[PDB]
């Protein structure tokens, strides 16, 4: 019974196969059929290509040896190679053209999710070309999804030598009968078959995947659209910056490129961005997912005033100062969305671009108390419940699992009503003791939030709501300004608190505002509709943030 | 008696003054003298410029108001503004032309080092221009060197209003007679004088600095060349990546741009790069200064084999994988320099460029044991002393302060001889109990190393020397390769262990190798000659790493 699946890189996990470029080059240059592929494999186990694939020599050292093999082959075939024939050019083009075979990676992802040990076994080289980064990026993206990556040039062994197959089995800690091995080269498949491994000759992906699902008993073809890659907290780079003597900010960091600072809402975590972190890094950005002040590994002082927008914003500027960042794109959700509009208003030189999920920009009404404003909206009743220090902390801290299971629900699953929360005397008074698990979250993901909130509880987070008068007075200083930097407003159809219509007058303050809108999406945008959030943010980033 | 120095930005800490561009524009466009400066100050306290400087409006909102003031002024002067007259263009150019007045910053640096509280008090704006990053970078660089930055647009107050001066004094916690205030605008200097502050009207920097040194009693002019900016450990962003279950790597992170991974030697710290970290970040790079395996906040497992080059290198690849970095430029010193050549040899796709300070690349001799090789060089005797587990740990751990004070010495201060270390029975047998403090280090810097080494001691670090046979066998696999990626070798004249001549045959293995050489420099390159290390690395980075 199968418990491991092994995949080749070229022609299996990555297409088009670099081998298929040699044939295409022969046809384009009208050279004898097989001339390039014959020069490539010249001398077999003793040849330059085996030396390259075993790691004896680098790609740049191999290029002239391949050129000499091509001359020798053309001489024997009684033909002439063109005026400007370049092996470097041929391979640079072949390599950049090669992309991830997405349905093959999806099938590998599915087998791994169903308990399989997965591995990439590849005949590859030590790439020292000026353009080696392209392949490095490809390998980096692919490898993360597998338990093992075995590279011929690293192990000093090559397919079809029997030793690499015995090395594979030892790495897998599996008997051959427990392994599926997928390869586009029949000769390289032969030693796995001979050992008793289930083998699949990959020509077209669909047939290979049909053979793969038939042999594993797991649905791989026609499966529903998978979720984006998530984050394993223990596999991330964790960052810590002290912004003032008693205040330290924690963040998760992934990728290279323009800095993108992710700001969560209430009562959340850097982990609320788990589905965006790998996607935005893969899209060419340096992601900084914050644990906002009062949360997770960030400091949580008890004083209410430590959580007014003016201080939160100043500390975010200090956070950039200490990291040596002149700018970052600021992306916020909920309370983070509010902070992000205020960063754009008070510190535009530090904000490359601004984006908010659900939270609109509504300027302070100078002719009305923020208390009056909040009272005027029935859905904002829970904010008055949040005012008295200790009351909401006691209910929210009593049972952590219940708190998150009750809150983190899709629009069709709601167990909470935000109206008459004060009158009812609590957020969970008409909510079950043991709520069911929402389709948006696993039990483990709820438990990460439970463990985070065991450190400081709900005092710091609730203090974000306890600065109405302070925030209002500070916001009034910005009443003559406009937001003229790149800005994106993302509304969620079914957010019954931060309704899409609350954002209707934003172009009066943000004339060049760009928009996104997510249908059938509740308040928990990032986990509700991760695929669509990623698409909206990446499209806006590549066009407006660079 | 003076204890605080206050500096203006425009025309004081930054030159040329943006005000002086309006006059230059008038002259270039042959407009009436003062037309632009008169339109700029139009309406005085009630005018658009005061609104901008107080933060009521942003720079982009102000541009058309300045245009209307220019039209009004030209109308009164009975003149016409040119065909393509643009305030945006004028200010974009003015702002990008403005650079830090280096001798003024040096004097501020010196006063602060001598115990003064320093501050920048500026009439500035909320910059939301597409090109606002240039100024953000300038402010970011300047602010780090001062105790306070007071910006008119942030405090809703402007010079010469008396309230900003009272705000300044309150921020300083100083009586006016204790303050020196430097400004290029006599009108803005007047309220400070009236309060009893010592004032300096800044025209040329030299005269201002002459007045400043006369009044403070501190040498500011003709002073020796200062050291580069160092790092305060508590003001840095600290990063942590788990590379395998029992192994976590710590790093300090500063800047944006191409990733530059700094690798220290024995027995050092990320802190050995303190003088390079701010310089390389300022030069346009994302610096990652490691605590190498066995050191500081990085894990230090006891097993010798955990420290062979093969595992150290693989973990550095995993470090890049987890941070989401397809590449980094690798810069090493001493044992870090050795690791860095091996990264280039075994993982060229992951190494953007490679640089080593002092450590040459010498390939394994396949016809000789590494023990034989080390025995053949008398200066390498101490490495045989390092072999026996426990012996060097006991001497190096006995007195930490003595260990670092004895080791970290300039070429003209040496207290240690690396020959006959085994025969003598120790590294410090002919060394004092209380060594004098080297000119390279302060007592506090020695104490940071003492505190770091209290965590894991010398076992992990000494284990870097205990893998000769393992490293040799692994290095032999690379004997047919060449290093063909961008590479830099930096030799130190007076390093009597890693002598410049040990690097003489490197072009046989690295044909395109670039070189740097530091005269009168011992083994501790980074702290011995920080200014010259920075110049060599930055020049090579900008040309070969991008
Ligand atoms: C639970 N959501 C919530 O209270 N969000 C607030 C964000 C700031 C604006 C008011 C609502
Ligand atoms: C104290 N320096 C030291 O032992 N450095 C080593 C680096 C690796 C090559 C041999 C010397």
From Swiss-Prot, chains A, B:
Per the record, the GO terms for biological process are: cholesterol homeostasis; dephosphorylation; epoxide metabolic process; phospholipid dephosphorylation; positive regulation of gene expression; regulation of cell growth; regulation of cholesterol metabolic process; response to toxic substance
Q: What is known about its processing and modification?
A: The N-terminus is blocked. The covalent modification of cysteine by 15-deoxy-Delta12,14-prostaglandin-J2 is autocatalytic and reversible. It may occur as an alternative to other cysteine modifications, such as S-nitrosylation and S-palmitoylation.
Report the principal subcellular site: cytoplasm
Reactions catalysed according to its record = an epoxide + H2O = an ethanediol; (9S,10S)-10-hydroxy-9-(phosphooxy)octadecanoate + H2O = (9S,10S)-9,10-dihydroxyoctadecanoate + phosphate; 12-phosphooxy-(9Z)-octadecenoate + H2O = 12-hydroxy-(9Z)-octadecenoate + phosphate; 12-phosphooxy-(9E)-octadecenoate + H2O = 12-hydroxy-(9E)-octadecenoate + phosphate
Q: Which UniProt keywords apply?
A: Acetylation, Aromatic hydrocarbons catabolism, Cytoplasm, Detoxification, Hydrolase, Lipid metabolism, Lipoprotein, Magnesium, Metal-binding, Multifunctional enzyme, Peroxisome, Phosphoprotein
Question: Where in the cell is the protein located?
Answer: Cytoplasm; Peroxisome
Instruction: Tell me the GO molecular function terms.
Output: 10-hydroxy-9-(phosphonooxy)octadecanoate phosphatase activity; epoxide hydrolase activity; lipid phosphatase activity; lysophosphatidic acid phosphatase activity; magnesium ion binding; phosphatase activity; protein homodimerization activity; toxic substance binding
Role played:
Bifunctional enzyme. The C-terminal domain has epoxide hydrolase activity and acts on epoxides (alkene oxides, oxiranes) and arene oxides. Plays a role in xenobiotic metabolism by degrading potentially toxic epoxides. Also determines steady-state levels of physiological mediators.
What the entry says about domains is:
The N-terminal domain has phosphatase activity. The C-terminal domain has epoxide hydrolase activity.
Please report which protein family the annotation says this sequence is part of.
Belongs to the AB hydrolase superfamily. Epoxide hydrolase family.
Q: What is this protein called?
A: Bifunctional epoxide hydrolase 2
Q: Which gene encodes it?
A: EPHX2
